[PDB]
Amino acid sequence: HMMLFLHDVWVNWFEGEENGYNVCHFHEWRKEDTVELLDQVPLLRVPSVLFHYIENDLSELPKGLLEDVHQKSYIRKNHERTKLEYCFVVTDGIGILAVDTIGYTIPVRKSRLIPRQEQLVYEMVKDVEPETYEFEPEYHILSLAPEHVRGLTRKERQIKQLMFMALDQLKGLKNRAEIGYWYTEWNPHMYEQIKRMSFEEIWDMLYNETIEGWSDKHLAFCENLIKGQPFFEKLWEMEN
Amino acid sequence: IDPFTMMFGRFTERAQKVLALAQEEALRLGHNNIGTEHILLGLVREGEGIAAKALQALGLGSEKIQKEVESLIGRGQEMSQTIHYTPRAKKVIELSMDEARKLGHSYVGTEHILLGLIREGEGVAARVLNNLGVSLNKARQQVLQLL
Ligand SMILES: [Mg+2]
C-alpha cells in the first residue's frame, strides 16, 4: 500500500506536446532521438479520465498528485544523483506515460516506456486501485486533429504536418495565380469551376481535398510544394 | 534488464506502418482499443513485406485471414478518436523485438510482428493463425527460407 517505484527507466522526452499521438511509442523511436535514463521514478495508477487529461493536454495537474511525487524521482546528472521536482509515471492499466514537469505544474515533458518496462508496469498495477486525486472536469493547421493523422507512421505525420505548414504559408501569400496552380496540381479537373473563385475559396477547396488521409499523391505533392523554401526543404531532408 | 539488449530505432518503416494501420483497422471496426486482431488485420492490409509472402507461401490470402478474424470479434460503438494499444497488443510488439534478437536480426520487420502475434498465444490473432493451421515453427521456417 506504499508508493510504487520504478528504477532505471528509459525515456524519450517530447516537450510541449498537447496531443498524445506526438508522444511517440517505443516502436516509433529513432536512433537520432536522445534517450535518457531515470534512476528512480514513482508510479501512479489513476482512472482513465485523469490519464487522458494528462496525456492529451497541457493543463494543471491535480495538487495532490504533485505533492505525492514531489522530489521522489532521481536522475544521475554529471556523476551526481539529483532530485527532480515533479517527475512520475502514470497509467490507467491501459495507457502508460512518463512525465517531467521540469518545475511547471503541467506535464511539459512526456514519454512512453520501452515494451519490457510497460509489461512490468502492467504486472505492478495488476492489483492496484486507482487514485482519484480529486480530479473533476482546439485543433488547427499547425496542430492536426487526431482524425487527420490516423493510420500514419511518425514519418508520415511529420511530412504531412510539413505539407500543411507549406499550405499555411501559401495562404498568407494571397497570390491567386499561385494557389490556382497548386490546386490544379491536386485536382486538374476543376479548371472551369475555380476560375470565378477568389484566392480564399480556392485555398479552402485545396485544404478540404488534402486534409483527409495520406497517399503517394500527398507525398509527391508535398515534395513539389516545398521546393524553393530552404526551411521546408531542410525539414524534408531530415525525414527522408 | 541488460542495456546491451536494449536497442531503439530498429523498427522498419513498413513495420511501423503495420502498427499504424492497426489503429485504423480498430477504428474501422469501431473498437475502443487496438488488440492483437487489429495488428493482424494491419499486417495483411500492408501485404508487401516478408510476413505477407510467408503467409501466402502457407496458402493464406488476406481475404481468408480477414474473415477468420471477423468470425471471432464483433463491432464496437466507440467514438473516441484517441485510442490505445491493449496490454497484450503491446506484448506482441515486445515479443517481436525478442524474436528479432534471437534470430540475430538488427531490425524489426513485419516478419517479426507475424511471429510476435503467434508467440503472444492468448489473443485473437494467435487463435486465427492457429485456426488456419500455421504453427510458430512453420511460420519460422517460412520466414527464414524467404530471407
Ligand atoms: Mg519490414
Name the structural class of chain A.
alpha+beta
What is the strand content of chain B? under 5%
Quick one: biggest sheet of chain B? 2 strands, parallel
Tell me the name of the CATH homologous superfamily of chain B. Clp, N-terminal domain
Q: Kindly give the count of domains of chain B.
A: 1
Largest interface: A-B, 35 and 28 residues
State the helical fraction of chain B. 55-70%
User: What spatial form of chain B do the alpha-carbon principal axes imply?
Assistant: globular
What is the number of helical segments of chain A per DSSP (H or I, 4+ residues)? 8
Compute the number of structural domains of chain A: 2
How are helices and strands ordered from N to C of chain B?
HEHHHEHHHH
Structural class of chain B: mainly alpha
The N- and C-terminal alpha carbons of chain B lie at a distance of: 29 Å
Total strands of chain A: the figure is 7
* Structural Rg of chain B: 15 Å
Protein name (chain A): UPF0736 protein B4122_0676
Pfam family, one (chain A): DUF3603
Family (chain A): Belongs to the UPF0736 family.
InterPro entries (chain A): UPF0736
Name a few traits of the molecule.
heterodimer, A: 240 residues, alpha+beta, 7 strands, 37% helix, elongated, B: 147 residues, mainly alpha, Double Clp-N motif, two-stranded parallel ribbon, 8 helices, 2 strands, binds magnesium ion, UPF0736 (chain A), UPF0736 protein B4122_0676 (chain A), unknown function, sporulation, dimeric
